[PDB]
Scaffold this active site. Structure first.
Site, PDB file in Angstrom:
ATOM      1  CB  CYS A   1     -11.182  26.710 -15.297  1.00  0.00           C
ATOM      2  SG  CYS A   1     -11.515  26.705 -17.075  1.00  0.00           S
TER       3      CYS A   1
ATOM      4  CB  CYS B   1      -8.295  29.869 -22.733  1.00  0.00           C
ATOM      5  SG  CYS B   1      -9.781  28.843 -22.654  1.00  0.00           S
TER       6      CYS B   1
ATOM      7  CE  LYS C   1      -2.140   1.393   3.666  1.00  0.00           C
ATOM      8  NZ  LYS C   1      -3.031   1.375   4.860  1.00  0.00           N
TER       9      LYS C   1
ATOM     10  CB  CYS D   1     -12.124  34.516 -18.659  1.00  0.00           C
ATOM     11  SG  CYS D   1     -12.851  32.884 -18.932  1.00  0.00           S
TER      12      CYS D   1
ATOM     13  CB  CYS E   1      -7.840  33.166 -16.325  1.00  0.00           C
ATOM     14  SG  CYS E   1      -7.113  31.554 -16.692  1.00  0.00           S
TER      15      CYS E   1
HETATM   16  S1  SF4 Z   1      -9.364  32.079 -19.610  1.00  0.00           S
HETATM   17 FE1  SF4 Z   1      -9.661  29.940 -20.412  1.00  0.00          FE
HETATM   18  S2  SF4 Z   1      -8.475  28.596 -18.973  1.00  0.00           S
HETATM   19 FE2  SF4 Z   1      -8.779  30.622 -17.929  1.00  0.00          FE
HETATM   20  S3  SF4 Z   1     -10.686  30.370 -16.666  1.00  0.00           S
HETATM   21 FE3  SF4 Z   1     -11.309  31.255 -18.695  1.00  0.00          FE
HETATM   22  S4  SF4 Z   1     -11.869  29.445 -20.000  1.00  0.00           S
HETATM   23 FE4  SF4 Z   1     -10.644  28.668 -18.212  1.00  0.00          FE
END
Ligand code: SF4
Length: 232
Positions: free
Chosen positions: A205, A221, A135, A212, A215
């Site tokens: 996300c 993206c 384990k 976004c 992000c």
């Molecule tokens: S920019 Fe693209 S990767 Fe970033 S949260 Fe929005 S959809 Fe998701």
């Protein structure tokens, strides 16, 4: 083959927004008993030690012994330079601590002589160590070396894979995404990609209305142009 266009850059951006590592799923399910600033070789030794001190033991008692060992500096050398009596008072009172003192001291000597200070990289060699069972061996291979049978794809990993278009075409189920991700992803990332993307989906996300606007993959993206909301 396949290589998702700008994935290595998209991955390190997901790692950046993840550098805080404060998402619910991971903290519920990840291991915190390791020095984050430790080099990968020292970390692998701390992973093996944390697994050898968790047989019928409370996670607070287990993590309490790790934090005491990390406080003194937890390396293969520092353990071998610690006498049995001192190391006993340190991991006390974890379950069966007397036998675990012998297990750690002997295993650390085996690693120093036969593995150059590292831990073994196979289940057969791990279970040959004193106090390490099957384990613990499979958990060590997954946490220290990232070796897993397959990529664990849930709703988060399935959603982020289709948003970033990490598959040839848009998959229809999380299982179809698994075969498409295993076509190109390095195996040392098969285990790390689950602990990274699931937390990424929970924090940024999101399933609906993702962040976004905050992000790093806003320009990387592909489907970010359709989910970016200014009024949000
Ligand atoms: S920019 Fe693209 S990767 Fe970033 S949260 Fe929005 S959809 Fe998701």
């Amino acid at each position: 083959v396949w290589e998702p266009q700008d994935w290595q850059q998209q991955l390190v951006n997901i790692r950046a927004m993840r550098n805080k590592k404060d998402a619910p799923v991971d903290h519920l399910g990840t291991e915190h008993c390791y020095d984050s600033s430790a080099p990968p070789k020292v970390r692998r030794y701390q992973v093996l030690l944390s697994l050898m001190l968790s047989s019928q033991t409370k996670d607070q008692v287990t993590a309490g012994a790790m934090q005491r060992l990390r406080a003194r500096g937890l390396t293969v050398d520092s353990i071998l330079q610690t006498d049995d009596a001192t190391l006993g008072k340190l991991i006390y009172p974890v379950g069966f601590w007397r036998s675990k003192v012998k297990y750690i001291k002997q295993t650390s000597a085996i690693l120093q002589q036969h593995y150059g200070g590292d831990i073994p990289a196979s289940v057969a060699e791990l279970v040959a160590l004193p106090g390490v069972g099957p384990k613990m061996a499979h958990l060590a291979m997954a946490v220290a070396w990232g070796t897993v049978s397959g990529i664990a794809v849930d709703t988060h990993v399935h959603r982020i894979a289709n948003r970033l278009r990490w598959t040839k075409k848009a998959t229809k189920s999380p299982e179809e995404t698994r075969a498409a991700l295993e076509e190109w992803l390095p195996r040392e990332l098969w285990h790390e990609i689950n602990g990274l993307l699931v937390g990424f989906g929970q924090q940024t996300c999101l399933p609906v209305h993702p962040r976004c606007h905050a992000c790093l993959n806003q320009a990387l993206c592909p489907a970010a142009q359709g989910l970016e909301h200014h009024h949000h």
